[model samples]
Target chain A: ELGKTLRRLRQGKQVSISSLADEHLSKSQISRFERGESEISCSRLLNLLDKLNITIDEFVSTHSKTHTHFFTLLSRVRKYYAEKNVAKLLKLLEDYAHKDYESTMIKAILSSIEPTVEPSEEEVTRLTDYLFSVEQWGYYEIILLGNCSRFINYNTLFLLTKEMVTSFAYSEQNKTNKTLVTQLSINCLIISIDYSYFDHSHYLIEKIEFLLRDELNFYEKTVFLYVHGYYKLKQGQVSGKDDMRQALQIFKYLGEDALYYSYKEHYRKEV
Target chain B: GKTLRRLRQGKQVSISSLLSKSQISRFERGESEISCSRLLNLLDKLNITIDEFVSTTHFFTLLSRVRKYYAEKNVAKLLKLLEDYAHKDYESTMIKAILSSIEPTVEPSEEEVTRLTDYLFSVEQWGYYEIILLGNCSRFINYNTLFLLTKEMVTSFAYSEQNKTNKTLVTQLSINCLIISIDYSYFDHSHYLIEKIEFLLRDELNFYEKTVFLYVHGYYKLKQGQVSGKDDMRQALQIFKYLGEDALYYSYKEHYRKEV
Candidate 1:
């Protein structure tokens, strides 16, 4: 996770690996650092961190979550999105924020999602430029877009989501980062369902659901139920309404007031 | 299928022991559907899951056919067979792209290359696709076209996913691209690619991949006028020898061997 995060930071800043190299480390060693294959002493890591303009505390805090807690955060984000409560969401974003690209990214995503927070064209352009630079963060980008999907131009949303989920769709190899894997899969599944890309959605959900069966938390189950309900509803299943209602009640029970009330709002408008 | 037919076929029970032959015939075909404990008993004896019989089609039968088609590399036949269904979406577009390149000298136009690779990136299969392109095209096609295609792929994939170079497949692709650069005698590009590939593989390589990496590493050392590069090449040859890749082993051996 640290390696991946560091790689993202490097690409985010558009820094060359050689430029980060110095007397203590060669270019190859810095490259190995990004691959998570090189071991660095405390002082060496500190120097490298300094070169990257990040402190140990910041790196540690950015990669604070482990194999389990990512889902927990996702649950919280969903709650924030449903409620349209930007303050707490912004606070949560701060906890997950990287000092560089990601810090600004969360701001852009939040601005887009919240009706009250209308960003200027320049701000939107920054987000667009960021999206163009790196494709990996599409999972996060899509979540914001999917929430405010009704307001955004449909063609733009469709193309963006399509690009994002494509990367999210495959590339399951031998890795132990089950948390990020599950997070990407669920977000991809949700976005696909949003776009009516049911083939890809079904393809991902099957593999992910089967693999993470015992590991899915209460809210993970809630997200699946809600999306699966919507899936069935689109298929004209009578039980889909019951699925949505059951999911909504669970959201309310869990104090996901935003999600619960958001469900109400959507249903009111939808019906 | 019927329990009686199962009973008759098994040596554990006699032909007349469980049920008569006509009753079995009726149950095995469309004539009848078995029910209740009788179907359960038969299924239990057969060691099949309840879900296995839920669908009339046997899953493995279809899976085997799909696997067979892939194993044969019968690209043309498969393309014709799945024409309409193939490339309907981005995921399948990759397979279509790969299949199109199966023929030697079948380097796709720049536009098609971008289209397929872009689709692959959009679908998150970029690294896998890179390795596939390298594996399939490295031997037979235009080296310059291959180089352009690979550079484009890595760039787009990197653009799509920042940490894409970290993938094992992408790492392999980088190494393979370095080999192509050496073939092209594009010294500047080869040197730059070598640095990146060496860094990518500095700590992680399987035996075969390491052999090729060492070969290239030695080539760079030789180019830099390091006499010890001969030893590095020989070490790579030793690995290829053990791995039974005779062509590569002999090729390296012949190129690097001296009288003493």
Candidate 2:
């Protein structure tokens, strides 16, 4: 809307494209962006809005139909960002970033800033205790595994099971191995418990990734990303962009969108 | 095997004790995994609760999910949302919710921090533990302008200082942790907070001042009060005390009350 509006306004005022371009930005850059190809930052766009004498409220209200059209784009961008869908993110950046878009861009950027880390142990305990206290058994289960995965890792899942298995149900060693047997039994119990109630076991991998991204140790952070990235890379090789999307989604949702951009630059290098 | 089992019918064939069983070890380390169902068969012989045997997996599954579910209730969001919902004083008597939810777990003190830090140095996953450790402290923390948080936590408690929880939906805390929401109304306002903090970042530290003030701030938040959930004023106050700044607490409520 801003692009077309500016172009028409400049023409009405009899301002030459070259002159307006120079006023706002380099003629070449202005030309490309005005022609829907110019690459610009929000900062640059804000500068443009100033030169054009457009108030944000005025723009949002005046161009609301088109503004909402843009808002929808924003909503979608945020939604995908939430889902950590890199391909959709890139696609949105490609598409809406080129739209005669002027308003909502700033707000959209602001909205993208999410919490980048997990809660404190105090918080974990509160949420944990309250969950049980509320008698919300379902919520309790979801948070425990989800949070454990987030804090510890999915190996926690396996570990939980393995311990339950040994500590509770199975053991052959003598009484002196009571501690050992008890531990194993707990692992066994964890396994059996999960085997019975945990849903969509395949999604456990997804769930683990979700948790690991948040709860992983720094070394695990690097290792998990590299492994998952490579895994996605392999998947992308067989499936194309999905691999890049998956890995990028992880990073972006992990509050590392800048890293995603850096990786995208790698794609540029490849091509 | 059946004939030998028949002769031994008086006794149960325990999973670990059962030698005639097939498939004992997994590939990860060639370690044998106990089969619960088969173990349950042995327990059945002992007349144990099939309830306990079958529900073992279910119980742990419940526990894991239970822990994760609360763990995901973004502390920041929880604080903030609690603020939003329990904003009215009327809400406090209505429910002891968000405050009740906070679980009274304070960030470990300086001593604990030191011990944990020492332990961290002795480990292989030191960096991961370090990430968790560093995030819990206050004063001059720089987690990069953008990377000011981990997936499970924010890099700075300063963000949550004064009931202001830095939350972004784009971040997992928005959905995962529910982003801490506290009723700012229940606590001192921002200018008040800034005043208290700035003052307490005072010149000197005293033992009683640091011990009580910081301990309270760190370990406890407001439980159910005039609002529905608890406010983190108490928790923030504890952390402030931890910093040895009792002067701040005395002045905490003044800034907001006097703010024109």
Candidate 3:
């Protein structure tokens, strides 16, 4: 397939049959590029790759499995945090933090340091309350739904992950060794991989895999996948039957009937 | 066979035994085949494994060479030029993507005229300059690139006094331009970053200029619900006051913008 596409691209570029052959390539080599034969060397392929405006990621992603670990973890966070089982949250932290994590206290502290906004005392109060409540953690990822993009207000996957990350920041260490501090510190850093400190949440979502590939972990990977599925579905990017099923799987992982049901309803609306 | 035996025995593996630097350069320069055998030989000679040769991080080093070919500086200059050219119809999606590079943050200076005529002076492109002139955006408010460009202009004007042209006129022009561009609404709203703002508002400016900051400046602040006229502007007013009196000039003119 690669060879076929490449040969087509080469021929389409008017790369002469003779010129291609002269460049250490037999006529067969040129045919193989089109035919998806032998792998071309980096330089050889890249020369054509640049002309074709194909990114290396294009080649890699076709071969490489998109790791979905972070999204899986986040899907778990979304479900439990939405349920507001204070014990479950604390247990989740203890299981992850105080024991294995060294940065537990720092994580807890950063999560607690709710920034004060000038003009909006009410926003500060509400945000502070939200920080303290452990339930409204879903609000952090609310992105600006510009008129062009349609959905820009109130609820978004970005806010939900942020809320979960923040909510978990304060929950007690349910397990003996783990602490709230470690989970918050690391998860905040990971969620940060997905959301900018400034806005551009949508654009970040658009180019997400490239932006956050290395920075996230197996835990956050699950969350990110569900997030991708959820937001994408919201934006009418449901490509196939498999996508709808994957989103349902994510809702199951999140474990909340209301959210799962709400997402299902949105799915039905699409139909 | 003797040469092959020598190769098997492992010699110093001089550059010639493989390909010359010129040949390697030629391949790198895309002038010749970057022959796999030549590359393999070099890697073998250098004790570099094939895995290391194909590592994404290592290949990315080549990306810098590619990026260097495409002038980011030229892009920045052209971006500024395009901004100037499209001062009126600047709201295209393409412009929004480009304007994402623009940050409303810069250093403040006290030059009068030079700020109006620096390498960055052409006001037509930057959307905010007209607002500053009309006093809709506070002179004390921060517009980052404008602030940095104005500082450079100030330093140049300070040096230009050595020239034969009327020194007084040039100096007054410099001082007035500084008062105009670097004053009032141009100062950054330190209300958000109160501690940092408090530190900067003192005399002679801070040694560490605010080069990088997370600003929700002016109209951009509206969406964050971080600032509002009835409730939010209360906090903003305090930051505006901390702005040095001379830098914060009062506009007597009624702000009548043609809504550019």
Candidate 4:
């Protein structure tokens, strides 16, 4: 992410890396960093920032603003998703979905989350091909597995499942982006569990527990508890029944009757 | 055959226990394939079925719908939907677990606590555990569980500190738990947590975290009716203003009482 930012800054200023590459660094070294192959020292990064004429704070804050825009849209999509209003989800997708990688990724997700509808085989092929066209373990792969997981072939699905296992290794645009990342991990967890990818799913749940320590909102808390309980049932380590029982009660405390009854029926049918 | 081996291993049920050792070994090695009746028996024991065992994508397609059902709050439908899945695979039974956990009548157990603690920590679900424990098992925690949580949080702190990551965050988590300890009258626990926090801080707090810390500290002081309580809070208000965190500053003013 820092590399991308530096590259953007250099491009924006129309300053070539050769110009920035002086006594402190060489041109090829700078090129490798921009392409995300190598890391630069903090002092070197600051010196390069000086040559590009952007302070660290300025660069970070600017990057944060762009994330602000992305998250605002993502939150809207989240709301639409929560409401299960695919029409609104699609409209939101249409409004924000552009020619970028995220647009294609989001489109795949929108189609995946639908009740009965699916993208055309051609679209699925295109999406899979797009994934094949990029680096195998890029962030978008996580998005695909987390969202349109059903469409991915088995070998690739498990292959890409490893990407989410080390999600803590990456940082987001800002703290506010934490929610989106958390939501993604939850999605990945559910998807992995769905496929009986227990090892990966268990690892993802552990990572989620570490990530959310005390940060989740009430609704998010409800979801996390439910997912955890579900995992236990899958693991058969304990009575998933009890953990889920508590989740329902907490939802009641939070005054979500609709959500409460949703699980009520589920519990009713179970044991 | 490979999928069968994975499914069996995942359940941790030994193949010898499920069937004859020779048959199990040959099937796992793919040197032999089983008949329909054998496959059914094996899948049944593994809590999976033929279709789901073969077509992972088909099962995944159901999961995508399951997510939608969860979202639409059409859980009855999701519940019914899960019956089909639960019939085939053990993993789909999680919805049943999720649903079952909702019933208020069931008393929580250490098993639940252990599973939840593990889950919450993996996801960093601090508030979720706080809410769940305080709401459901407030009186259930023994000295051992509290110590375990304390150890976990400190380990988390060291992990973050080593990475130079979540700078004030790990510190904040420690303080939040400490605040909870004080509310529950676990004074020694609270004191130990605070000293650990003070050792870590007395320096590295960022703008908002410092404001929250001071406010929490002031609240603690005021609860004891100490004279400096007001002064501590006053200092908090000043820092809030200097930081331009006006919303909270105004909130403190709006809610301020000379004495609680």
Weakest ten-residue segment in model 3 chain B by summed lDDT: B251-260
Clash count of each predicted structure: 5, 103, 70, 30
> Which candidate ranks first by lDDT, i.e. highest?
4
Could you give the TM-score of chain B for each candidate, in order?
0.50, 0.19, 0.18, 0.42
Q: What part of the reference interface contacts, as a 0 to 1 fraction, does candidate 4 reproduce?
A: 0.00
TM-score of 3: 0.22
| CA error at residue B117 for candidate 3, angstroms | 36
User: What is the interface root-mean-square deviation of candidate 4?
Assistant: 21.6
For model 2, the superposed segments whose C-alpha errors exceed 4 Å read A1-229, A232-240, A246-258, A265-271, B1-260
Q: Could you tell me the TM-score of chain B in model 3?
A: 0.18
* Residue-wise C-alpha lDDT for candidate 2, range A70-189, written one tens digit per residue: 224445655776686655554454553333211123223323443332334454444344323321122113323332333333344454433322233211101112222222323333
Kindly list the per-residue Cα lDDT of model 4 for residues B193-231, writing each as its tens digit.
767766766544243454455666666676666667666
Alpha-carbon shift of residue B49 in model 3 (angstroms): 20
Ranking by TM-score: 4, 1, 3, 2
lDDT of 1 at A84: 78
TM-score of 2: 0.17
> Could you tell me which residue pairs clash in candidate 1?
A166-B122, A166-B123, A166-B124, A167-B123, A167-B124
lDDT of 1 by residue, B142-176 (tens): 56655665565556443112122224566566777
Q: Which CAPRI quality tier does the interface of model 4 achieve?
A: incorrect
User: Residue B199, candidate 2: how far off, in angstroms?
Assistant: 18
In the range B1-260, model 2's lDDT, one tens digit per residue, is 12223212322223344334444212112344333224334433333222222222222232233345457865554444335544433222112222334545422334533443343233321121223233323211222211223322332211211111122111222111111212222222222332343244343222223223332232223322332112333433433333223565555434323321
lDDT digits (tens) for residues A164-196 of candidate 4:
444322332123224435666676677677678
